[PDB]
């Protein structure tokens, strides 16, 4: 399907000004004009590839007088010649006619065997040229300095790819034509086989000869294809270390990928929040588990892997540490190499969500290691109610397109450990939480002034990178992420890159960046950060708050209400930074009665299967609705955001909601309900 030969077609006479770059699967190297105006006249054209077969052959084309043909560097056209079953031969073909009266080029390629069967060279005996930074022992490689297949001028001057029903075209970019048609205009360094410096050529990327599992956005030459993994623990379950009654504490967790300032760190970490709610009694966990001073405890949890990246992993999963406190590693989760039941795809889990999560200590695994804590680690644990999950960047082997057989395959000689150094070396990183408020990294090829090779890649402008990498557009002129204006998110950098940007603005006589993004330029090693303005973000850049206005507003559209609970319409996004609600009744004088006056009893919201939110007033009022012994009493519901979420009885022990900073979001009389 992606096999055959590779044609350059120049409008000029000498392979100087390339019009179309394409491939035919059989011998017929034609191109109907039905597939292309003042430029549709090729005065020269080249064709490159190999050939496999045993017999005595004679090559003939439909123009043995405009052509030259070499098989393994020997001339054959400007006569019979022997070939052998099970060997490949280079194949170069040139063409030149001085004033082609027609548009396009009709040109087939024949071969006649010994029985005299002449014909066009089947697609089964035709293979591409080995466009790859290195030569195989079967195939060798030789206006394509980086050898990626896309001709130099084209890679410098821009090029587009029209996806015809058989094969693809690669042609110069033209404003009047493709600009209206909305075809994506490409550019890329002619001296990088791959410009985002990853493992797919600038050629494989645009022509679809690439691991299908790679992100559509990373199909761009300047958008970097590479994995990004983190471990999403989904919940947890604690035991006393060794015939007594089941004495454990099972609780959900919430895990978010993190980035600590922007900061030049390339690590993969995420941070677990063990739920602090109510699971009968206000017992300490040792009181809940019969743990003594000199006891031990052990941990278990279902965890999935998360690729928030653009390339996929195949045979080796990255090794995690379960750290507690700042640096106390309780465990080291490993997966069994070259044995991955499935692949882990970008924007996707392993095990898939339709399947089970991994348990740290799987059912019948006799070699699963006890994750143990001493006593003061266990207190420590309850105190902080949180564990971190650092994950290396050993990702194993890569699925590289094979040219000879036009098939994508895991390739043993190509490892992700030999590529990340340079991706992260010669690209500028961006981190955006615009999607479901999660930190999502990406990287874009950007000029490295103090490095001559990185000054051969096209310029990358802020406005552009957002569009190629993250999919902004400008439907009416203003730049947008799936609805939201680019002004809705803020810009953080790290320090060197901040200075850098600052400087540029003074130069453009600009005072506001949002209105000069197109003019801002991106250099390699830049780190950038972009977060929805509506929110407060902790030191790990996770969303953990909001304005009192943002929240109150969010909850303003109430649907129904009753002495049994509120039924609102709240944004999935707001709903992500809320940790619970408080319910109280205000008598006529001003006293307040707290229906659920505990720090682990605030979990009374439950998202319906219809998208709306219901606030179960009954859940902690003893399954009873609310009793209002005077209609002029008010029913007041505050909201509590994660940043003001108490998770342990105060210093004096008071386990009430007393003191908790919360937000009034609903108030009505007994008679207003
Ligand atoms: Ca090239
Ligand atoms: Ca290139």
Tab-separated table of C-alpha atoms in Angstrom, residues 238-481:
chain	number	residue	atom	x	y	z
A	238	UNK	CA	-4.089	-0.815	54.350
A	239	UNK	CA	-3.414	-3.879	56.540
A	240	UNK	CA	-1.556	-4.769	59.717
A	241	UNK	CA	1.516	-6.918	58.991
A	242	UNK	CA	1.427	-10.482	60.299
A	243	UNK	CA	-5.926	-15.116	61.950
A	244	UNK	CA	-7.771	-12.120	63.488
A	245	UNK	CA	-10.792	-10.290	61.964
A	246	UNK	CA	-10.405	-8.224	58.773
A	247	UNK	CA	-8.915	-5.016	60.202
A	248	UNK	CA	-8.213	-2.657	57.271
A	249	UNK	CA	-8.922	0.802	55.831
A	250	UNK	CA	-9.907	0.982	52.181
A	251	UNK	CA	-10.214	4.421	50.574
A	252	UNK	CA	-10.283	5.975	47.102
A	253	UNK	CA	-7.467	8.102	45.750
A	254	UNK	CA	-7.143	10.839	43.174
A	255	UNK	CA	-3.955	11.048	41.155
A	256	UNK	CA	-2.817	13.955	39.036
A	257	UNK	CA	0.262	14.423	36.859
A	258	UNK	CA	2.428	17.216	38.247
A	259	UNK	CA	4.900	19.870	37.199
A	260	UNK	CA	6.985	21.812	39.737
A	261	UNK	CA	8.319	25.195	38.651
A	262	UNK	CA	8.049	26.350	35.096
A	263	UNK	CA	10.924	24.085	36.106
A	264	UNK	CA	13.484	22.473	33.824
A	265	UNK	CA	12.684	19.063	35.326
A	266	UNK	CA	11.978	16.289	32.824
A	267	UNK	CA	10.861	13.748	35.410
A	268	UNK	CA	7.478	12.041	35.445
A	269	UNK	CA	5.649	12.469	38.714
A	270	UNK	CA	2.094	12.364	39.931
A	271	UNK	CA	0.630	12.811	43.414
A	272	UNK	CA	-2.029	10.697	45.094
A	273	UNK	CA	-4.669	12.104	47.358
A	274	UNK	CA	-6.013	9.455	49.687
A	275	UNK	CA	-9.586	10.364	50.469
A	276	UNK	CA	-10.141	11.794	53.974
A	277	UNK	CA	-13.909	11.252	54.206
A	278	UNK	CA	-15.991	8.932	56.403
A	279	UNK	CA	-15.425	5.168	56.322
A	280	UNK	CA	-18.368	4.301	62.052
A	281	UNK	CA	-16.162	6.104	64.556
A	282	UNK	CA	-13.427	8.690	64.636
A	283	UNK	CA	-10.619	6.207	65.171
A	284	UNK	CA	-7.015	6.758	64.304
A	285	UNK	CA	-5.841	4.277	61.750
A	286	UNK	CA	-3.818	2.285	64.320
A	287	UNK	CA	-6.951	2.320	66.454
A	288	UNK	CA	-8.734	1.164	63.336
A	289	UNK	CA	-6.193	-1.588	62.663
A	290	UNK	CA	-4.798	-2.631	66.036
A	291	UNK	CA	-1.327	-1.323	65.325
A	292	UNK	CA	1.191	-0.896	68.148
A	293	UNK	CA	4.352	1.154	68.591
A	294	UNK	CA	6.495	-1.716	67.294
A	295	UNK	CA	4.009	-3.026	64.710
A	296	UNK	CA	4.233	-2.851	60.917
A	297	UNK	CA	1.671	-2.102	58.200
A	298	UNK	CA	1.302	-2.839	54.494
A	299	UNK	CA	-0.251	-1.221	51.460
A	300	UNK	CA	-2.120	-2.246	48.354
A	301	UNK	CA	-3.797	-0.364	45.513
A	302	UNK	CA	-5.105	-0.621	41.970
A	303	UNK	CA	-3.016	1.453	39.578
A	304	UNK	CA	-3.128	2.166	35.855
A	305	UNK	CA	-0.450	3.643	33.665
A	306	UNK	CA	-1.076	6.871	31.802
A	307	UNK	CA	0.362	8.080	28.543
A	308	UNK	CA	-0.282	11.832	28.400
A	309	UNK	CA	2.174	11.995	25.508
A	310	UNK	CA	2.235	11.549	21.722
A	311	UNK	CA	4.246	8.383	21.047
A	312	UNK	CA	3.337	4.868	22.304
A	313	UNK	CA	5.265	2.313	24.408
A	314	UNK	CA	5.439	-1.366	23.415
A	315	UNK	CA	7.593	-3.806	25.393
A	316	UNK	CA	8.967	-2.083	28.527
A	317	UNK	CA	7.115	-0.090	31.171
A	318	UNK	CA	8.901	2.590	33.219
A	319	UNK	CA	9.822	1.790	36.806
A	320	UNK	CA	8.109	3.698	39.607
A	321	UNK	CA	8.977	4.555	43.191
A	322	UNK	CA	6.245	5.055	45.784
A	323	UNK	CA	7.687	7.833	47.907
A	324	UNK	CA	6.126	8.985	51.147
A	325	UNK	CA	7.059	12.239	52.822
A	326	UNK	CA	9.735	13.989	50.803
A	327	UNK	CA	12.037	11.044	50.094
A	328	UNK	CA	10.985	7.867	51.923
A	329	UNK	CA	10.533	5.251	49.167
A	330	UNK	CA	8.179	2.515	50.414
A	331	UNK	CA	8.075	0.508	47.177
A	332	UNK	CA	9.254	0.029	43.573
A	333	UNK	CA	6.581	-1.018	41.074
A	334	UNK	CA	7.992	-2.940	38.125
A	335	UNK	CA	6.281	-4.476	35.119
A	336	UNK	CA	7.544	-7.612	33.340
A	337	UNK	CA	9.645	-6.514	30.336
A	338	UNK	CA	8.952	-7.635	26.742
A	339	UNK	CA	5.667	-9.120	27.981
A	340	UNK	CA	3.195	-6.237	27.746
A	341	UNK	CA	-0.235	-7.797	27.214
A	342	UNK	CA	-1.184	-4.727	25.178
A	343	UNK	CA	0.462	-1.510	24.060
A	344	UNK	CA	0.147	1.774	25.946
A	345	UNK	CA	-1.078	4.462	23.560
A	346	UNK	CA	-0.826	8.212	23.792
A	347	UNK	CA	-3.884	9.604	25.550
A	348	UNK	CA	-4.663	6.111	26.959
A	349	UNK	CA	-4.189	3.713	29.884
A	350	UNK	CA	-2.664	0.325	30.479
A	351	UNK	CA	-4.581	-1.714	31.406
A	352	UNK	CA	-7.280	-0.190	29.208
A	353	UNK	CA	-10.236	1.193	31.185
A	354	UNK	CA	-12.547	-1.542	29.861
A	355	UNK	CA	-10.197	-3.942	31.677
A	356	UNK	CA	-8.999	-4.340	35.286
A	357	UNK	CA	-6.421	-2.128	36.904
A	358	UNK	CA	-3.138	-3.645	38.015
A	359	UNK	CA	-3.036	-4.458	41.731
A	360	UNK	CA	0.336	-3.739	43.309
A	361	UNK	CA	0.108	-7.167	44.973
A	362	UNK	CA	-1.819	-9.054	42.334
A	363	UNK	CA	-4.077	-11.918	43.426
A	364	UNK	CA	-1.961	-15.068	43.184
A	365	UNK	CA	1.445	-13.520	42.527
A	366	UNK	CA	3.776	-15.209	45.031
A	367	UNK	CA	6.579	-12.838	44.145
A	368	UNK	CA	4.704	-9.579	44.649
A	369	UNK	CA	6.594	-7.647	47.315
A	370	UNK	CA	5.114	-6.484	50.587
A	371	UNK	CA	4.841	-2.689	50.597
A	372	UNK	CA	5.627	-2.148	54.312
A	373	UNK	CA	5.533	0.860	56.679
A	374	UNK	CA	6.911	1.202	60.191
A	375	UNK	CA	4.760	2.800	62.829
A	376	UNK	CA	5.843	6.431	62.450
A	377	UNK	CA	5.594	6.163	58.691
A	378	UNK	CA	2.040	5.108	59.188
A	379	UNK	CA	1.215	8.048	61.387
A	380	UNK	CA	3.181	10.211	58.997
A	381	UNK	CA	1.042	8.746	56.270
A	382	UNK	CA	-2.284	9.484	57.978
A	383	UNK	CA	-1.030	12.991	58.738
A	384	UNK	CA	-0.187	13.886	55.127
A	385	UNK	CA	-2.720	11.560	53.478
A	386	UNK	CA	-0.613	11.649	50.264
A	387	UNK	CA	2.033	9.659	48.299
A	388	UNK	CA	4.101	10.608	45.229
A	389	UNK	CA	4.857	8.411	42.182
A	390	UNK	CA	8.101	9.225	40.340
A	391	UNK	CA	8.613	7.332	37.099
A	392	UNK	CA	11.727	7.084	35.072
A	393	UNK	CA	11.860	7.474	31.317
A	394	UNK	CA	13.107	4.063	30.342
A	395	UNK	CA	10.452	3.197	27.730
A	396	UNK	CA	12.076	0.411	25.718
A	397	UNK	CA	11.871	-0.191	21.996
A	398	UNK	CA	10.249	1.771	19.191
A	399	UNK	CA	7.883	0.845	16.371
A	400	UNK	CA	9.742	2.120	13.338
A	401	UNK	CA	8.361	1.992	9.826
A	402	UNK	CA	10.370	-0.448	7.705
A	403	UNK	CA	11.023	0.837	4.176
A	404	UNK	CA	11.833	-2.490	2.487
A	405	UNK	CA	8.513	-4.067	3.441
A	406	UNK	CA	6.461	-0.912	4.050
A	407	UNK	CA	5.295	-2.292	7.419
A	408	UNK	CA	5.569	-0.656	10.876
A	409	UNK	CA	7.329	-2.905	13.428
A	410	UNK	CA	8.843	-2.899	16.912
A	411	UNK	CA	12.501	-2.439	16.126
A	412	UNK	CA	15.001	-3.846	18.582
A	413	UNK	CA	17.879	-1.559	17.571
A	414	UNK	CA	15.854	1.597	18.285
A	415	UNK	CA	15.277	2.578	21.926
A	416	UNK	CA	13.522	5.698	23.359
A	417	UNK	CA	16.532	6.226	25.662
A	418	UNK	CA	18.564	7.223	22.603
A	419	UNK	CA	16.118	9.911	21.519
A	420	UNK	CA	14.695	11.797	24.522
A	421	UNK	CA	18.022	13.531	25.192
A	422	UNK	CA	17.741	15.381	21.878
A	423	UNK	CA	14.002	15.897	21.724
A	424	UNK	CA	14.182	17.647	25.081
A	425	UNK	CA	17.455	19.241	23.968
A	426	UNK	CA	16.277	20.853	20.745
A	427	UNK	CA	12.587	21.578	21.299
A	428	UNK	CA	10.689	24.094	23.435
A	429	UNK	CA	8.210	22.548	25.914
A	430	UNK	CA	4.659	23.700	26.569
A	431	UNK	CA	2.376	22.589	29.371
A	432	UNK	CA	-1.324	23.233	29.039
A	433	UNK	CA	-4.204	22.166	31.283
A	434	UNK	CA	-6.923	23.429	28.954
A	435	UNK	CA	-8.233	19.883	28.633
A	436	UNK	CA	-10.130	18.678	31.737
A	437	UNK	CA	-7.705	20.808	33.834
A	438	UNK	CA	-4.890	18.264	33.550
A	439	UNK	CA	-1.244	19.102	32.953
A	440	UNK	CA	-0.397	18.022	29.424
A	441	UNK	CA	3.113	18.482	28.116
A	442	UNK	CA	4.139	18.806	24.509
A	443	UNK	CA	7.158	19.989	22.594
A	444	UNK	CA	7.778	21.965	19.421
A	445	UNK	CA	10.914	22.388	17.283
A	446	UNK	CA	12.325	25.845	17.966
A	447	UNK	CA	15.491	27.670	16.912
A	448	UNK	CA	18.497	27.327	19.250
A	449	UNK	CA	20.463	30.518	18.458
A	450	UNK	CA	23.738	29.243	20.000
A	451	UNK	CA	23.611	26.002	18.001
A	452	UNK	CA	24.034	26.260	14.186
A	453	UNK	CA	22.045	23.114	13.358
A	454	UNK	CA	18.960	24.313	15.303
A	455	UNK	CA	19.020	27.563	13.275
A	456	UNK	CA	18.171	25.506	10.155
A	457	UNK	CA	14.707	24.629	11.420
A	458	UNK	CA	11.867	26.972	10.563
A	459	UNK	CA	11.108	29.767	13.049
A	460	UNK	CA	8.447	28.805	15.587
A	461	UNK	CA	6.057	31.512	16.841
A	462	UNK	CA	4.006	31.249	19.991
A	463	UNK	CA	0.722	31.565	18.121
A	464	UNK	CA	1.773	28.850	15.716
A	465	UNK	CA	2.940	26.299	18.302
A	466	UNK	CA	-0.401	26.494	20.099
A	467	UNK	CA	-2.111	25.710	16.830
A	468	UNK	CA	0.088	22.866	15.544
A	469	UNK	CA	0.740	21.247	18.893
A	470	UNK	CA	-2.467	21.861	20.856
A	471	UNK	CA	-5.010	22.679	18.143
A	472	UNK	CA	-5.963	26.288	18.631
A	473	UNK	CA	-7.529	28.158	15.749
A	474	UNK	CA	-8.682	31.654	14.926
A	475	UNK	CA	-12.180	31.228	13.506
A	476	UNK	CA	-12.893	34.949	13.690
A	477	UNK	CA	-9.354	36.236	14.187
A	478	UNK	CA	-8.916	35.663	17.936
A	479	UNK	CA	-6.970	32.499	18.971
A	480	UNK	CA	-8.986	29.774	20.769
A	481	UNK	CA	-8.790	26.398	22.522
